[PDB]
Design a protein around this ligand. Structure first.
Ligand SMILES: O=C(N[C@@H](CO)C(=O)O)c1cccc(O)c1O
Ligand SMILES: [Fe+3]
Length: 261
């Protein structure tokens, strides 16, 4: 319903692209404020699982976002009949395992390891297409994701910091490949030299540790990252919520934060 609606201070339009290999099909939903852009361009919020993200963007949030410094919203979705692509997101949101050649997801068995190709496409194809539709302030960009989307967000921050000002990971799948993402954090302070980033983290109080000790891995990660120079960290636990529900909750709360400086 939201994408057709005409009563909000945002208008949504679609920008379509394929992956470089031709196997995955994207539709970016662009939400542009009626408000004129600042001289330096709109700040930008990029959202993974874009078809689900659009379903969570409520009217009250969107009215308040039009506050004189409203962001451009870019929801990166799959352009499929079903409006999901389990294979596509499994490949696009997971890092490669240097260990071996068996790049298959340990849970669902589908090909994995496409995170760097996905982030390269965002940089080299998606942003070019979005910037042609609306002026962007490239110093004021946010990347948000939930679950495997949050895994991709942490991969981006940990291995290629500086592409975004603010990283936002909701219920990231820290269990993935027995904690492999936690290894990628080693070396971050060196990679952040001369740069600044903000990381927002959420987890629901009712979530298990994995889909098959709850909270422990996140608590350890938070404790570690609080020590990292150049990184501003904000962890928000979500009392009363389980795994599915932290998607909408995190996005509402993100969009209520002060805009990136
Ligand atoms: O990370 C989870 N699921 C992912 C699929 O592997 C996802 O991306 O949601 C996950 C975590 C805790 C509990 C769950 O039921 C769950 O699906
Ligand atoms: Fe689950």
């Amino acid at each position: 319903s939201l994408l057709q609606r005409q009563d909000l201070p945002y208008r949504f339009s679609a920008v379509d692209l394929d992956s470089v290999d031709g196997q995955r099909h994207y539709r970016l939903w662009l939400g542009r404020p009626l408000q004129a852009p600042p001289a330096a361009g709109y700040p930008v919020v990029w959202m993974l699982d874009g078809n689900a993200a659009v379903g969570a963007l409520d009217e009250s949030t969107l009215r308040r976002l039009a506050d004189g410094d409203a962001p451009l919203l870019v929801a990166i979705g799959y352009r499929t009949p079903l409006r999901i692509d389990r294979a596509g997101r499994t490949f696009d949101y997971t890092p490669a395992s240097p260990g071996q050649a068996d790049q298959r997801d340990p849970l669902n068995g589908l090909p994995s390891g496409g995170a760097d190709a996905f982030l390269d496409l965002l940089r080299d194809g998606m942003r070019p297409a979005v910037a042609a539709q609306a002026p962007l302030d490239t110093a004021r960009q946010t990347l948000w994701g939930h679950a495997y989307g949050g895994l991709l967000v942490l991969h981006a921050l940990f291995t290629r910091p500086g592409e975004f000002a603010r990283y936002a990971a909701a219920s990231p799948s820290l269990w993935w490949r027995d904690g492999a993402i936690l290894g990628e954090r080693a070396g971050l302070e060196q990679r952040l030299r001369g740069k600044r980033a903000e990381l927002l983290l959420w987890r629901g109080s009712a979530e298990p540790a994995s889909p098959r000790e709850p909270g422990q891995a996140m608590a350890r990660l938070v404790d570690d990252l609080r020590r990292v120079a150049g990184l501003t960290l904000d962890f928000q636990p979500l009392d009363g919520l389980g795994h599915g529900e932290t998607l909408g909750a995190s996005l509402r709360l993100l969009l209520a934060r002060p805009a990136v400086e």
